[PDB]
Design a protein around this ligand. Structure first.
Ligand SMILES: [Cl-]
Ligand SMILES: [Cl-]
Ligand SMILES: [Zn+2]
Ligand SMILES: [Zn+2]
Lengths: 30, 21, 30, 21, 30, 30, 21, 21, 30, 21, 30, 21
């Protein structure tokens, strides 16, 4: 795979891709 | 957190798995 | 605001817009 | 749950706001 | 909800989210 | 260009790409 | 209308261009 | 317009409703 | 990673995330 | 092919990685 | 149509839009 | 390549067709 900058909507789309049915958390303040 | 690791810096798909439930 | 019909990645996009910096949890069934 | 409801029927942004942190 | 920067494609996705069936206009020159 | 099959948010994305700075109106039925 | 046609059948970018400002 | 309010500056979802038909 | 159900533009988004700077070929049938 | 499989059934990111350059 | 900056995910979404069934290649290193 | 033509610079939809198969 690769390392890229993933920000905002794109970061959460990526989380959705990788986690799917497992679910995920997006916690930018943490 | 994630923003720093993946947006400000860069991260892998495997690193993104860190944020799965 | 209007009601939404959101599947897959489109739900995550809505969560992102709704929550912004607060972040959110994506928690599908099984 | 919300994920399922939004896709199989409909849901509001108000309902979505419950899943924010 | 929150205040965020919404630009380009992301701005129109947000308009679609909020307006839906009502329709909307995206008029960046105005 | 090819013909398109576009529902929901994907139509708005196409309008955005097609119109760019000119902007566009999104006008669904009822 | 266009919104409906693009989704239920097909549409071209040329047709879409009619909805620009 | 919208670009200035929501992109250059920041805006709310309620402000975005200003641009609905 | 989880398995994916990806149609249309969503496949291209996945390819983009997976391949990043390496790029990719999008090759649908007929 | 991959495009069709991902949409009609399912596919993995590993399978997708085969289409990278 | 118009000339705009199209980058990353947005560039590949645009390629998908314009090429569709023909397929395309995204080769950023070239 | 494409990045230079369409991202760094700007390009048309017709220019994007250059990258179709
Ligand atoms: Cl961006
Ligand atoms: Cl979809
Ligand atoms: Zn973007
Ligand atoms: Zn979709």
């Amino acid at each position: 795979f690769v390392n890229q900058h993933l920000c905002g909507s794109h970061l959460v789309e990526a989380l959705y891709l990788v986690c799917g049915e497992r679910g995920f958390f997006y916690t930018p303040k943490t | 957190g994630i923003v720093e690791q993946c947006c400000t810096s860069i991260c892998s798909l495997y690193q993104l798995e860190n944020y799965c439930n």
